[PDB]
Design a protein around this ligand. Sequence first.
Ligand SMILES: CC(=O)N[C@@H]1[C@@H](O[C@@H]2O[C@H](CO)[C@H](O)[C@H](O)[C@H]2O)[C@H](O[C@@H]2O[C@@H](C)[C@@H](O)[C@@H](O)[C@@H]2O)[C@@H](CO)O[C@H]1O
Ligand SMILES: [Ca+2]
Ligand SMILES: [Ca+2]
Length: 122
Amino acid sequence: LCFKLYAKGKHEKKTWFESRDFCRALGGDLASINNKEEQQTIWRLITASGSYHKLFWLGLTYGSPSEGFTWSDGSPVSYENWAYGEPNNYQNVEYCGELKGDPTMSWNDINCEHLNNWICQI
Ligand SMILES: CC(=O)N[C@@H]1[C@@H](O[C@@H]2O[C@H](CO)[C@H](O)[C@H](O)[C@H]2O)[C@H](O[C@@H]2O[C@@H](C)[C@@H](O)[C@@H](O)[C@@H]2O)[C@@H](CO)O[C@H]1O
Ligand SMILES: [Ca+2]
Ligand SMILES: [Ca+2]
């Protein structure tokens, strides 16, 4: 699949569900990162755009209490790159996952209504 970053104006940021709908309207989904190669591809897109340290929705969303986090495209959550201490479900309201667009490419759980940039896969 091909990845595309969306870092529009800050008043153009979207919730997790709005971002999922945007990507699904293109016939795709929010990006799943299933291995280090995909991670590098996205990191290089970040460097090419020159937009460093920005946060982006990924396809991470909580499933049942038993499952924990899942990918919206149904891919397995085998590879994980959570930031240290994450997921921390801060204040019990963090059920979606974002990417921190710096070299570490780490993941964080955050409230799904938070406004973020996003990354689609097509
Ligand atoms: C600048 C600052 O002090 N931010 C605090 C939040 O931590 C940042 O959260 C963002 C989330 O996009 C990012 O992870 C930064 O690296 C953090 O410094 C803090 O958020 C809470 O703790 C985070 C570590 C993370 O788990 C986040 O999901 C969680 O809500 C909030 C709430 O304590 O306070 C901010 O001041
Ligand atoms: Ca993937
Ligand atoms: Ca968190």
